[PDB]
Structures are given as structure tokens and as C-alpha cells.
Amino acid sequence: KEFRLGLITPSPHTWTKAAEAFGAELSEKSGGAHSVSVFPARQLGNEAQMLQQLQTGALDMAFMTVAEVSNRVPNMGAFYAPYLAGDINHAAAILRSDTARGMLAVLPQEAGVVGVGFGSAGMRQILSRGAVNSAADLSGLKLRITPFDPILDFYNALGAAPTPMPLPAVYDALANGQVDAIDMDVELINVLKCHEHADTILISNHMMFPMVGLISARVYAGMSDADKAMISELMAKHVDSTLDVYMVKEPEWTDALTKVGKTFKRVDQSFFGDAIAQWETIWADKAPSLPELRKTAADLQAENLYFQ
């Protein structure tokens, strides 16, 4: 079978490279019986469209933001609690936990997909065209976000003017004033060069940004038992590999952003004032897994169960 795998990330992106590597290994491990054609950069549609077609089985596979999945499955919102993870190594440990993996079990019924495991991209940061000395400076700023509710809620609590926008439009929107600021990670701030029309880079690490490897449940059901096991395990390995890339590269991409001539500041949870508490109130009855995920995150940190 020639499977198709969609992503929204550009070609240089870690996810796209991981999907290509998965595709190569599947071809080899299957003795050429199967192949994967990778379609990055939104070639097959936006993420919402891709999920619709995973659900029907018109699309076989995706490396998808958990952000999009949360639009369909609001419990995935739990991963976006601000400052749940203290850094990318903590985030990776959370995403590998039994608590997190247990949350995947609902996906075949609730979204028509099998989730094999979690990967991630980088922590979320803020880039702005003007000075930002306190959270009050975010008030009324047209601020680009990924189109999902957890981040919309965070910025609405802060009083910004969040504006959903997909990746390809972001650079131009900054350059032309359609937005004043963006929510982004350091990999894409580097790759998309969004720092070019920014004044201030705020390294806030305010939210994690998980990824999930998905197989259409309709397609999975048509696979032989041997292939269900082999393909899901292999995909899980490649999804998991992204966590180690970000563990290594996150501080490297961050340091590169000290060399682009802009005002560079690190801020912590206190910077955001009451927005974190407001977010909790919004999400308490939307994402029932949140208390258990918070306990898991706290235990990983207390036990020093990651590189820190």
C-alpha cells in the first residue's frame, strides 16, 4: 500500500524530516510492500481538513498538532495549561508518561484516528513589533495564534487581540502590520525569519506544543494484524524521536535569536499575572484530565526524572 502522510510544517521542519525518515524506514522494513508519500506544508489542506479526511480514511496518516486535535477532542486542551512544563525536557517527560499516553485511547471513537504516541515542537514564545516591558503592553495587540482554543483563551485573559493564522501568512502579516505580535516557537521564528520585523523577542516558554502521529482508524482497521503492530510501533518511534531533537535544539535555536539584533528578554510565569488562573477556570470543566496531568508533571519534577 502507498500511504499518504500529511503535515502543515515546512520542509526544513523537524516534523517533516521525521515523517520522511518514517517513510524511508517503512519502505525498508516492509521489503517494499508499503511506502509513504509525505505531503508537508499544508499541501493536502489545513489541519482541520486533514483531520476530516483521516476520519473518513481519504487520508491515511498525519503528523498533526495536538492543537488541531483539541478542536475535536477538548480534553487534549489539558496539555496546554500554562507553565505545566518548566522547559522542553520536562515537557518530553510529561508526553511520555502513562497519564499522557492513556489520553490517546479515546481517539478512535472521538476523532476516527489511532494516535500512536506523542512528539512535540518547541515551547511557545512571543515576538512583538513594539516594546514589551510587562503584560499590560500586550493589551489590544493583534497577536497571531495557532487556530485552537487553549491559546485563544490565554491571550483573551491577557487582553490581547488574538488572531488565528496559519504559518505561511505570518511573516507577511508582521511585515505589513496585519498583526503586531505573534505566538510562535524558536524553530519557526528562525526558519520563517519572523524576527526580521520584530522589535522584541520574549522567551516565555509559556505553553508546550505537542504533536501526535495519527493513522486513520478506517485505514488501520484494514491492515493485517502484523502490519497494525509494525506500522504503529515504527510510527511511534519516529514521533518520539522529535522529543529528543527539541531537547537538544531548543536552547540552540534560542541562542541564535540573541544574534538577530533585537531586544531579547526571558520572562517567567509571574509576567502573565492573573491570566494563568483565568485559564484554569475556563478549562476545569473542559479537560477532565487536567488534575491528573498536573500531578504527573509535578511528580516528574520533584523526582528529577529528566535532564535539568
Is 254 flagged in the annotation as binding? no
Tell me the C-alpha distance between 154 and 125, whole Å.
13
Q: How far apart are the first and last CA of the chain?
A: 43
Asked if residue 88 belongs to a known ligand binding site, the reply is no
**Closest by Cα among 96, 101, 74 to 85:** 96
Whether 181 and 143 have beta carbons less than 8 Å apart is answered as yes
Reported residue count of the chain is: 308
How far is it, in rounded angstroms, from Cα 247 to Cα 89?
6
Q: Is 124 annotated as a binding residue?
A: yes
Q: Is 34 annotated for ligand binding?
A: no
Q: Is 253 known to sit in a ligand binding site?
A: no
3-state secondary structure of 201: strand
Task: For residue 157, give the C-alpha cell.
Answer: 485573559
185 annotated to bind ligand: yes
Q: Is 15 annotated as a binding residue?
A: yes
Locus of grid cell 484554569: 280
Contacts 24+ apart (CB under 8 A), 139-145: 141/180, 141/181, 142/178, 142/179, 142/180, 142/181, 143/179, 143/180, 143/181, 143/182, 143/183, 144/170, 144/173, 144/174, 144/179, 144/181, 144/182, 144/183, 144/184, 145/183
User: CA 65 from chain center: how many Å?
Assistant: 5
Q: Grid coordinates in use for 42?
A: 499544508
The gap from C-alpha 279 to its chain's centroid, in whole angstroms, comes to: 18
Residue 215 assigned to a binding site:
no
Annotated binding site for 3-hydroxybenzoate: 13-15, 124, 144-146, 185
Annotated binding site: 13-15, 124, 144-146, 185
